[PDB]
Amino acid sequence: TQIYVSPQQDFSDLMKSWKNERCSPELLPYPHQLMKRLLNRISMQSQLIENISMGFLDMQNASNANPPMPNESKLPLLCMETELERLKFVIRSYIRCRLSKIDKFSLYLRQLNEDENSLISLTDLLSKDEIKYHDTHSLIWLKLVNDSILKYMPEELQAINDTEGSVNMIDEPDWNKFVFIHVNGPPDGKWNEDPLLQENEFGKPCYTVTIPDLKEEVELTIGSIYVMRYEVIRDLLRDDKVALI
Amino acid sequence: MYYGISQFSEAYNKILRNSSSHSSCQLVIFVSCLNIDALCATKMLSLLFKKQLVQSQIVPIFGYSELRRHYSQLDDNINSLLLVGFGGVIDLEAFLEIDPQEYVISFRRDIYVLDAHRPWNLDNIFGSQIIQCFDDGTVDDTLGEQKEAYYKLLRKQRKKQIHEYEGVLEEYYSQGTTVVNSISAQIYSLLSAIGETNLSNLWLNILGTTSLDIAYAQVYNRLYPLLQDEVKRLVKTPDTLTLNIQPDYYLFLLRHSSLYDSFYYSNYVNAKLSLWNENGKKRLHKMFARMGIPLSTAQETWLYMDHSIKRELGIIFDKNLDRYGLQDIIRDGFVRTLGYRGSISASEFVEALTALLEVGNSAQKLTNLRKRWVSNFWLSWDALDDRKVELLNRGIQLAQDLQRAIFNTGVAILEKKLIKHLRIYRLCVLQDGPDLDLYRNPLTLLRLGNWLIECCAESEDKQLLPMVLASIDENTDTYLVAGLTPRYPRGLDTIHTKKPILNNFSMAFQQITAETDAKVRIDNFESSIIEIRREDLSPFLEKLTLSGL
Amino acid sequence: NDDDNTEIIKSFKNFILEFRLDSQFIYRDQLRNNILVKNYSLTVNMEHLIGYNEDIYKKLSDEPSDIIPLFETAITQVAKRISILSRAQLLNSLPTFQLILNSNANQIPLRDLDSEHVSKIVRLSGIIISTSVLSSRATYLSIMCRNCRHTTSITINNFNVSLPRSCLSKNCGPDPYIIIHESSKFIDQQFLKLQ
Amino acid sequence: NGLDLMSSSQQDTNNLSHQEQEYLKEYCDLITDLKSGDLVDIDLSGSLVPPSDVFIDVRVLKDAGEIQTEYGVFNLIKDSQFFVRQSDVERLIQQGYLQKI
Amino acid sequence: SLPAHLQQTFSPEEIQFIVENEPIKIFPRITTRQKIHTRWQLITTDDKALNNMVAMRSTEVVLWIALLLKQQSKCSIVAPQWLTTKELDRKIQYEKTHPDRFSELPWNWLVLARILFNKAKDDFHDPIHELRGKIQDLREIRQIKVLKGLKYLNESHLQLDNLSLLEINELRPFITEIMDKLREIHTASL
Numbered sequence A: 001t002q003i004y005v006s007p008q009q010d011f012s013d014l015m016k017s018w019k020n021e022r023c024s025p026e027l028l029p030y031p032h033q034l035m036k037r038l039l040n041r042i043s044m045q046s047q048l049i050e051n052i053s054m055g056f057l058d059m060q061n062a063s064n065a066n067p068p069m070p071n072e073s074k075l076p077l078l079c080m081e082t083e084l085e086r087l088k089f090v091i092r093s094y095i096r097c098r099l100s101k102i103d104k105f106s107l108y109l110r111q112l113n114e115d116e117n118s119l120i121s122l123t124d125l126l127s128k129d130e131i132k133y134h135d136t137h138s139l140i141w142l143k144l145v146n147d148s149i150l151k152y153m154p155e156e157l158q159a160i161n162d163t164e165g166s167v168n169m170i171d172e173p174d175w176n177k178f179v180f181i182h183v184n185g186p187p188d189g190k191w192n193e194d195p196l197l198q199e200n201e202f203g204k205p206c207y208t209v210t211i212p213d214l215k216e217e218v219e220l221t222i223g224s225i226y227v228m229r230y231e232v233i234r235d236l237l238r239d240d241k242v243a244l245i
Numbered sequence B: 001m002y003y004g005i006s007q008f009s010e011a012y013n014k015i016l017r018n019s020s021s022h023s024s025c026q027l028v029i030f031v032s033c034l035n036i037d038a039l040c041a042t043k044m045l046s047l048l049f050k051k052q053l054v055q056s057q058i059v060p061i062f063g064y065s066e067l068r069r070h071y072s073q074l075d076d077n078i079n080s081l082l083l084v085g086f087g088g089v090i091d092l093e094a095f096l097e098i099d100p101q102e103y104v105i106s107f108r109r110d111i112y113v114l115d116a117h118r119p120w121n122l123d124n125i126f127g128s129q130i131i132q133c134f135d136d137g138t139v140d141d142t143l144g145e146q147k148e149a150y151y152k153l154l155r156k157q158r159k160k161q162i163h164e165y166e167g168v169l170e171e172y173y174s175q176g177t178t179v180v181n182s183i184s185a186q187i188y189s190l191l192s193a194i195g196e197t198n199l200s201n202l203w204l205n206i207l208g209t210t211s212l213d214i215a216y217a218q219v220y221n222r223l224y225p226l227l228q229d230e231v232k233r234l235v236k237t238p239d240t241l242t243l244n245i246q247p248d249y250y251l252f253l254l255r256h257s258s259l260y261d262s263f264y265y266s267n268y269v270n271a272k273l274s275l276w277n278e279n280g281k282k283r284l285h286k287m288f289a290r291m292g293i294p295l296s297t298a299q300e301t302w303l304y305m306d307h308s309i310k311r312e313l314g315i316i317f318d319k320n321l322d323r324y325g326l327q328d329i330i331r332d333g334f335v336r337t338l339g340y341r342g343s344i345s346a347s348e349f350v351e352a353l354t355a356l357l358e359v360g361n362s363a364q365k366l367t368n369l370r371k372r373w374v375s376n377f378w379l380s381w382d383a384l385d386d387r388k389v390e391l392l393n394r395g396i397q398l399a400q401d402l403q404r405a406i407f408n409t410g411v412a413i414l415e416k417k418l419i420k421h422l423r424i425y426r427l428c429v430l431q432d433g434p435d436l437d438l439y440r441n442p443l444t445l446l447r448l449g450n451w452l453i454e455c456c457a458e459s460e461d462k463q464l465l466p467m468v469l470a471s472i473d474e475n476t477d478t479y480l481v482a483g484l485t486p487r488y489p490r491g492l493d494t495i496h497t498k499k500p501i502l503n504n505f506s507m508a509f510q511q512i513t514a515e516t517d518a519k520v521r522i523d524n525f526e527s528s529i530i531e532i533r534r535e536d537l538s539p540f541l542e543k544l545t546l547s548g549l
Numbered sequence C: 001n002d003d004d005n006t007e008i009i010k011s012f013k014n015f016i017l018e019f020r021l022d023s024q025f026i027y028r029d030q031l032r033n034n035i036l037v038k039n040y041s042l043t044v045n046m047e048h049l050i051g052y053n054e055d056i057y058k059k060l061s062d063e064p065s066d067i068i069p070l071f072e073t074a075i076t077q078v079a080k081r082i083s084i085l086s087r088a089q090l091l092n093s094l095p096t097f098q099l100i101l102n103s104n105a106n107q108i109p110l111r112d113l114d115s116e117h118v119s120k121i122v123r124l125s126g127i128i129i130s131t132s133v134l135s136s137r138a139t140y141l142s143i144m145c146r147n148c149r150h151t152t153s154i155t156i157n158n159f160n161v162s163l164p165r166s167c168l169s170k171n172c173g174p175d176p177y178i179i180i181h182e183s184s185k186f187i188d189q190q191f192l193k194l195q
Numbered sequence D: 001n002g003l004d005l006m007s008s009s010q011q012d013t014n015n016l017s018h019q020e021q022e023y024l025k026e027y028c029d030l031i032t033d034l035k036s037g038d039l040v041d042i043d044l045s046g047s048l049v050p051p052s053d054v055f056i057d058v059r060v061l062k063d064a065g066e067i068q069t070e071y072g073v074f075n076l077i078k079d080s081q082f083f084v085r086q087s088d089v090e091r092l093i094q095q096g097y098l099q100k101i
Numbered sequence E: 001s002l003p004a005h006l007q008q009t010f011s012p013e014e015i016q017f018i019v020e021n022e023p024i025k026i027f028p029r030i031t032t033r034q035k036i037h038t039r040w041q042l043i044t045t046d047d048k049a050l051n052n053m054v055a056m057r058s059t060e061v062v063l064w065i066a067l068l069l070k071q072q073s074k075c076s077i078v079a080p081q082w083l084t085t086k087e088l089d090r091k092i093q094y095e096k097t098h099p100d101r102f103s104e105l106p107w108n109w110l111v112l113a114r115i116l117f118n119k120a121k122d123d124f125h126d127p128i129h130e131l132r133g134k135i136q137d138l139r140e141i142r143q144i145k146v147l148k149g150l151k152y153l154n155e156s157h158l159q160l161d162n163l164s165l166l167e168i169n170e171l172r173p174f175i176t177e178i179m180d181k182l183r184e185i186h187t188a189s190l
Ligand SMILES: [Zn+2]
Pocket: C145, C147, C148, C149, C150, C167, C168, C169, C170, C172
């Protein structure tokens, strides 16, 4: 993101990102600017609600005066506070899901990070607190498992990052998991300037994808829910072209 | 009066101006536990205050010690407090050491006491501004003379006025405790004046009114036409709700038990036909044979009972009851039906509620009993809503069991002739027997006493004497003594109903305890129920015999 | 004669399709869950039937052996309605559904049964002392003639039929019919002794 | 909430190994540290059921004194019912002091 | 959110929340037109509709705000077009006449129905029981069609054009796992 059309657009983007993250079998990058805007918005909203509450409380407790009129007083404040609660819940759920996924794939991510050839780096995919979480958790878990079992283990296989022998200890994400998708089409209102979509009989613009293993071609028209594997649909997901349900 | 009939709404408005807030609890309600009318009023108030989203808390209490302790616990933040079901007969300020100068600013707090007992503390109204109550229309007309003396009492020949005022105050006092109006009725009058009446409110008002049928039939008969007119003013779709005026009878769970048991356990039928000996059963069998219902047919559930006889039961009763003289059993009652669930009557519902209150789920054991009672009250409260029926079928079966136990104990009492006839008041003591642990509940004891007093009244004796009933709780080694008022036969005219029979037992007990160092504990909201020691019962008794009642 | 049967069937079908408490149609979901597990049966409680409408219960208690089959065929009509698609027009291996009842009426001792309990619904308790071996019963009989030699089918209910007289229209015998055992439907029956 | 709730779940947590116990303590330390960063205005260890209603009825389960709240005070009289805001009693409900959401 | 396996699919409460975060029409009982008063000034919804509101006129608000106003006497919800007998009749006719295609219905199917039947009871122009029964019949026939179509489970893909959110959610853990197992079997065999 570079600019906001409206905060409601930011809310919609956050909800779509949460829905995509919840069902995806792979850890996705981090939209820093969206939450950078959202946290600041929450800060101003909390500050203003506290200021107005203090104002009415001081007005009511300075003297008898006039009690606040029930009309147009309770309902707005109730609406703001409940909306803030719902937004906080959504953010909390998204963050907890990301934390669970980072807990699952700790060793694989750490192995990927030290590779110089990988164009993807840990800085882009994670927030700084998540990096500190991964580092501390990996260190403490390694110390625990070393103090418990590995100290009596032979040196030749004391390493827990072994990828040789019979079975590997690295847990790669399953890219072939089946997911439910809804073909959203191009995000633009024109929805017809994309250079990838094609046409069939009776119009019905479609997106054509191929399965390398099965040697097939599958048409994906706009407005139909499909059940397709995840490996062949990463690009369309990352281009906001299709939305997982 | 402080708050007349026409002022309720105004007072209600004040509550909002002192309680309607965003994130502050500024309203607490204390309820007289072990009372149906208080429960109905509390339910109606809870619905009202849930409508306008006014935050509140409901706290059951049992004794005056609990009331004092809970009031001492409260913080100054609570602007409004409600006291439903008690507080009329005593001066709260003296009890609660309330300083008006401490709460001047005026109107630092507000305590609304809502009670139905007719003799009430005159100083509580004419002296205090902090305490305020809802009059039923009594101060305006009845107390037109007492207020003058109180105002005057608030050159050597002027002592005549002081003597006259003292005499007037004494004459006003020394009166028995009675009940003349309903809390649910007052609350529904407020609701009708405001404009928030509906079927749930009407049902709760009907329950609150019909809860008094056993003891205050005069009040019930005075109030019934208003309910009838209000119900008149207000395809079997699975969401229908019907309130009708159907004929009903003084019968025990007619629509949930067999007709034979319904006739067998009915208190009025028992009193009129003496079912505790064999001649009563012979007369009952004669009744059944002459009506023409087979003995095997009459011993079946009301659901599977024959449709034709269920239809013609009214005519059968009309033609057969005259000879036996039970023509006072037929009356008019309210029936509520919701979809395909079935039919429930007000009497059956209130008996189920009472029994569920009775049964459900030294000082330490007394506290445990009192907390069990408040838990039973909460369970009964939860049973009110229409979404629960396993909490009502259980109550109905428990009512059947409790009535069986009461009948089994009363027949033994009447066999043993334990009712000693003294010169002033009758006396009976349940020294020993079976299932005596059930009678630790004051409401169960009152039920037993009501049956006993009905049986005594339905006799040829021409003496109206108060009855004293006592029990035993061997764990505590204490007697639970309750005073009972005499009752006229239900089939009597209104000319000999100039004033209901008063109760002087509270006055007698308080005078004896204040003049003699007896080891009693008078803390129940019912001033005629006390706990006395096993060794202290007798001397006390002779004292009560020798004291002016 | 047929109008009354149709009225009774319609009444029972309306009872099945319209009975609901709170927000659940209990009997339709029961039929679904029964068909999914291949238990072609339905359980009716007396209290629900009485609460819905009293006339149906009165008719059921009056002449049970004549009314029950109408209910048990209304059940299978509803099951075929709510289990299969018309498809603008097959297996259809759905026999007549079994009806099972529950009640909470007053019990009647065995020795109390007498002439007034004939053709009535009764509830009683005892102890089982011996169970017979199961035997077969015919429900759908495929019948073949011998001289004219045509095909016919007979449907038999278990409550409360013989070879038809004369042939269906030359000059056959009184009952020139035989039973074709193949393409016939059979059920199981068992005998019990109570003490 | 990263407290391990020694006041109320097994009591002495002695069925764990000592290494597992120090791992639990350090994990509680990490959880306390995590919400002290840029997410200080959001309680991560809160409920995850979406907020559906604003005013609910709640019933007390254990006896206590009176607890200060924002602009108000809640006196936890034993076996009483409150008609209060949903966003004010979630902490008490999670602790087990309240009942009948 | 871990909670064992609750990290893979949506719970019904989340579905209710995501559905109730949608626009709806409303007929207000009060007026809040500015004097030509506290500003709503919300962050995730246009205020200009709420602030510039006059009684007895049509306007669009989010569903949860509509429910909050419905709790008091400040609201009168307008039922959608598809919640009436004359629309559900043609809908059920469409399902009956077409034995292979799911009829077009909003993806909030059964959910807006549950919410409206639970809360907005006294504003319907049609009896509640009839609409509930017809919705039950619709659910019944759609369930039959889904069960019939489930028999084909290819290892490549599948198409489900007009299934609502709850119907997809309650079927995801079975279809997904079965197809994943089939894919694993095929891949391990080559
Ligand atoms: Zn022939």
